[model samples]
Target: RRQPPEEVDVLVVGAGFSGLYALYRLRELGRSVHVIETAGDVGGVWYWNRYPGARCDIESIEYCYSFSEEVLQEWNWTERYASQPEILRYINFVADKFDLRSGITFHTTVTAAAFDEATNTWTVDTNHGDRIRARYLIMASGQLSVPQLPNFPGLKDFAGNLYHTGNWPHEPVDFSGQRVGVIGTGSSGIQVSPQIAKQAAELFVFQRTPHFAVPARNAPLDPEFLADLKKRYAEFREESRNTPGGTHRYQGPKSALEVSDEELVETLERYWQEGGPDILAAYRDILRDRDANERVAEFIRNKIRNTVRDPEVAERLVPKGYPFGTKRLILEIDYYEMFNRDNVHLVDTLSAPIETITPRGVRTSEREYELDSLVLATGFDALTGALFKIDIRGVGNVALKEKWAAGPRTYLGLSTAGFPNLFFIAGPGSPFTNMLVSIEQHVEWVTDHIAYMFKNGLTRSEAVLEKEDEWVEHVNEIADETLYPMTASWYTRVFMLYVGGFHRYRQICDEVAAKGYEGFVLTH
Candidate 1:
């Protein structure tokens, strides 16, 4: 008879930044852990997202794990913004350095996870016909792992060879002699379109909603920068942990209005040229005051008009009818400048919707352009998608998906009320700051909490229902006070407002961290 499936002390889903670090922390606690990743290897998003020019918006130095000083001292990043391959390599390096892969089951997807109230253990089932039992189930499944592919008519029948940015082929795609049509001008599209144009015979970019993109000002990393970073590593790590948003040395001034316009422009320009995710926080009132913010938005809009050769295309690309920094801003090396290429074309899908995908390429109301390959840069469902995709049933068989049907509701964005002994890394309700920073904090906090529970001889820890509601209310109330809710971006789902407002969401996180787990009930 086959031996019973190996029971584990902890189970982790997805091997992205969250899962990888989760594994690192859990193992440090000497927990007998098992990690299930759908992909064949480490690098959760990096494993799947192989599109060209796909570089991180966060500086390579700032984006990585700082938990280990040895890890930091040894590895060197080659670029200011590491591309997909480099990022993947860094992830692989971490996995190797930590020996994280041996404990992980690759190319395996978790089909369902159910908590047994009687035993207080999680039963995890996978598509590969492996059922494992664990004391705790940790969903490190990324917020943006689920790819959103719209069902267009005739997509299957007329497809030449289709590609999605979320699932790019391992083999290099040659666009040198082929006509290319790219749909969605989101982050991936902005990055890939330029590289495609460099080689493709012709390229057409399908734009539904034009994005607000800024120059990444990418460059090869200076060895001196690395040396300096290493010197300040201790102080930087300590400072970033204490700071809002997990980024070090990025505290906005008291007020932008207090400064002269000339001084303000210089401030904005300095961070803009410096180029990183924290550029949005250059001014204190940028997110709160519309008029004050627009001054900065105008600065980017001017950059777009100046960069793009066509006046009409520039107008189409510069977003109107929405607040700046609403949807996730895609930083670029030369995203807009790609349009200047004679072979590149921009199709306004908002005005003329795509009717179908023909045998050659996508067809719109006005025209059809045939192509050898197609790419879908459509982004992930965000926050809830990665977790909801798995069938997770908590106490009373309450499904995680059902709980989040209207929108995501979490006590702390870390644990659900009914889901005992479960933790979500960077799962939202956190500071929503630098994700790497958030992930590290979640892992540390959850691990420490678990240790405390074990020390207290407790096998059960769940959010109280009444407190969950209050926390959810507090989350919304904080969001309503800010301009973050004024715009309908991915941060705020079109169907639900609960998922909206990243800044307020982060504020709630700050409140909780400051209060030392206030609003939480702990018992043995």
Candidate 2:
């Protein structure tokens, strides 16, 4: 057992990219900082999610950290889209290179944290009985860290191997000659099921709701292109940071509704052929006007219909009831094609509904599908769920969970008013975009603010209550303008995030910081 420092200038929870960088940057700023992570090592979500076919949707080039020029110039990405193993390796490389593990206490979970009004410090307790105090607390606990297993009776009694994609087995799992049943059709469900189909004698995909996923035309990164990209990598990243989507995709100028039906089809066809999740950027109004979204949605539906040979199965796969791009856009590689396989079967749970999980297998309304293995591809609690796990108390012992019961309220999604010196990276209420870009921006912004406070000998920094209210209103106002809030998803659940573009959000954050962190109260 490692003994953590009794006190530090900052305490960051989680050892993902955000926490790792927070530790690196704060150390550079001469602050005594330490990190606490539940996982045995770094990589956070990537570390635990080792299921087959796990890969990032964002391109390899755009998904990496841009803070290090040395890493940018040195590392070569083999694929256009990096898989989980590769991503975990990259995280390890960065951690070892910067000696970040020395500053992190792995396999330790923060159970509770309280802000001392008089001292303007946070008293933190971990599951390991570590009582640490710090002037600042950063929750780098990721948005999609907490895995939620679908509620089903007899899950505990399942006879065979049972797995959840979020906390998958580290060792390779073989389903050869075994009957496999996978539940949920979210990103994890979509990715892992195809791989299981290869080995399983029979693969049954239990779908509650079909999610929209475009083709991920993943390929190897060209060496010549890599060299060219590295020459101006920093410049390229800056350009991306200023964009609304925070990706390299060009924002379309025309509305989907404005274009002629034939022209719209042609345009969307081009995007579909180009392959990737960038089709969301194919039309500026795709996620805005309902008519515009439907047109684009129909195009994707038609594409999905054409992918599967069976019309009945295709219709079941086609996502409906919600506007496109409302939920997180997924990119798929041969996911639809996998259904064409003889062993792969699509169980429409929406039609039949799951009754329970029996020892033999899953029992739905229609019949029982006996299986030797079961994989729960069910999604996470998402966004604030990670923070809700810890008992965090603010002014007057106000619980962060209670305060945010309705929704998360914050100033720039960075800090809440009562919780002095507390900050969140990619917390709810922030812009929804390419997480890598947003994560880097947040880490930098929060760290820079801390540095600014230290330089001025400031001990307490908190968002004003009224200011947070106003910001929440603004976030809702913008979100209402789009179709994002109309759907049932993690983004819409509570604390409907700033549906505003990341490029615009960055300018707003920069101005606030430059203006002495306006809308916040700072004291010595």
Candidate 3:
């Protein structure tokens, strides 16, 4: 039997960093809010992704919440880049500190959500057969929550232990005496392979597309540096918020073409040595002009070739064809050096594509390799996957999946037309900045808007249809101007993000709010 619907002012989906913060802020605003999560606890991606060597690509200091001064000053990060365990600990700390769990229901997933036209509320149904009514529906579902499984034949026939980096087991699996195979060459594969190589008797890495990765050069955070940073944390966070990538990275004033060959190599080499993913900002035009991009790309390729002992193997590791910074720049820790290990083998699937997953192991076009264990690090459906999982019906019972068949359409990546009182945090059309920056900005903005609507005796809010169309067009136009849309990577095809600049996008969002929430229809 279905339970009677419980009412709340706002119902947030996914108890991630975004949803947790949303819950905290809405409570501060004195609104009744509840959160639903599929996981048993908080942490979102940090909770599920427990694979070995799983860590944040972004530096630890800047990847945290700046909304609270106490949180910023109190918590200490041990490393420059934090591992998944440390990050998950931080998330749990935040949730407990604020007592956010009571408001959040765990081990349940939101199955369906429908907007009620008469009452300007959402009736959300859960997999547990619990229905909830809320004046506002907030989708804090993460960007990379849904993992994409490879479309291969005989996957069920695999007779070995199978694992996915995105959904790794909580308890560590012993790979010391096992022969292991890992698929995908994205960040997950790169990060996981080195750790596996340490334990596995033999490890095979399957590569579909080679990705450009700069060494992380990660080390323990110095106490002196942390103290100095804490002294001016507010200013540091402000500076980061004003930047394009939403990090403290400084964009080079000069173009790649302007610098001489000697100067370009020297500058890039310095960044390569210093390490971290900020090497993408070593020059201004790295993502703008093809000629400028190739110069930087070639330098990194040379570095990869120099790292591995074998010429044939090193050449296979270099990323070609795509622009340098178009795809997400991966931060690697001894990933390239791992190829030099006799136990580690790189299977280039581009040359010999994968045919099927055999009973014993993976079968490629050329031959079959036997494995004791198999791991898939193939990434996610990204931006819209989580949202589409729910059966969402808007005005006139229009399904969200049908509406987004052409791709996601939204105003400032927040609200969509016909979906009154519904909002998304860091949804499609949002800035392609650091996840923390993007999440914080969107959550605050949407929450503030909801509060404003309540204060003004408004019960309904939705983006104007024409404005949504215009915004989508504008986002695509700006994306087309760059090398982002030209690549075969996930960044293209869907018009996922606004690449103009994080600061610029924030400015536009601010201006909209300033002008009585332009592009949005608010009513009593």
Candidate 4:
């Protein structure tokens, strides 16, 4: 006999930033909420990713929660870009201070969540064989939660210790004096390689695609700046909620090409000196105009050229294939500087793909390298991976994965056509600008909509099919209007292009959100 589900007012999946905030908001609304988490505790991604030097790219002050002024004023962030431990500690503080831990079911992975039309509730099935029913279901699983481990030949034949940045072991492993080989050069790899370089006997960095990384310029937070920010927290949060990418501070309109050769040089020089995302802000058109973007791109390429001692090595390290800022932008402190170390070595995987793993080390098509440990910093499957893992059925047992197999389709990255009464936070189409900002935006929007439902005695709320299709087109159109689609990077090709250009898809979503529920229908 199948066990009955534990009923609740709201059921939130995953205990990451999104889920935690969602629960917080619901509680504030005087509604009972339950959270399902796969990990043993809170801090979702930060909980698992304890890899050396793992830190947030966004600035600490702006990246944190603004929901509670008391919490914000009381908590102190130690650094500009918080390390994993620091960020995780902040999450724990929020959980403890708000008493959010009591409502969460830890160490439980949800296998399936099906919407029952008869009851107008979602029944979430877990791996532990527990089914929980709730009036509203929120998929708060993070964008980068699911890790991808490529199938390399003879991977099992290797005898050396192996570690992945995504699924790093809980306990620390001593890499001291060990010859380490790291594969992948994504954001995680960029951060991990530099830290390991400081400790490893010899570090081999295997790069398939060299991403553009700006200096993080990290430092201890200034008390004066924090005090000023607190006074303006409300305004800042409101401004971020309306920003394109859910981040505070706009890039501003100032074209690098609009000025003369000397002026352009001066502007680039100034921001480069400032470091960080300021490089992207050197010119407003960088994300839109290719010529302008390329101009700054060459400037960065030249910077990389000068940083590396060998000319050929410098050329190899600079990203050439994609437009700048198209992929996930990375912030670094000593990423490029670490290459100057005597023990650090770079191998271009484009010319020599990793063929197999030997007991002693990895063997590439061109050469073999001996190593004591292997670190896989390979990136993730992204956005749809979490949803696809579940056997989610909508009206008529239609698989949500199958619906998304053609590509993900959602209204405002929240609700889908078939999946009524189900919502996703910071999902595909929304203006999820930055991690924390976006999470809070979704939490607020979702909780408010839920309150609206209860007040109106609404039984079901969903995206109309035609409106959903139109919104999907709008997202693709806006992305196409920008140069984001020009690159073959993951952001452009991975999710939406699998269906079509999803840029237009997000454009429609923005239109809908701006229109204040003009296009949506609420059923009673």
Name every residue pair that clashes in candidate 1. 492-500
Residue-by-residue lDDT tens digits, candidate 3, 423-453: 9998788998888988899888999999999
Listed per model in order, the count of residue pairs whose N, CA or C atoms clash below 3 Å is 1, 0, 0, 19
- Model 1 agreement with the true structure over 18-40: per-residue lDDT tens digits: 88887888788877777898888
For model 3, the local distance difference test gives 0.91
Off by over 4 Å in 1: 1-5, 249-267, 490-524
Taking the tens digit of each residue's C-alpha lDDT, what string does model 4 give over 1-524? Answer: 22333998888888988999999889989887889888888988899899998999888877888888888889888888899999999999999998988888888888998888898888889999998889889999877888885688888887989899988988877889999999988889999988898889999999988989888878889989888888888897777666555555546577867878787777778777766675666667887888888888888888888898877777789999678887767887787887888999899989898899998899999989999999999877767788788889998888998887767887667888988888998777665356676677568778888887887788788888887787677767767867777764435222352222223334444566556554567787
Model 3 lDDT, residue 191, Cα: 94
Provide the global lDDT of candidate 4 against the true structure: 0.80
Q: In candidate 3, how many Å is residue 301 off?
A: 0.8
Sequence-dependent TM-score of model 2: 0.98
lDDT of each: 0.78, 0.90, 0.91, 0.80
* Of candidates 4 and 2, the better by TM-score: 2
Task: Estimate TM-scores for all models.
Answer: 0.92, 0.98, 0.98, 0.94
Better of 1 and 4 by lDDT: 4
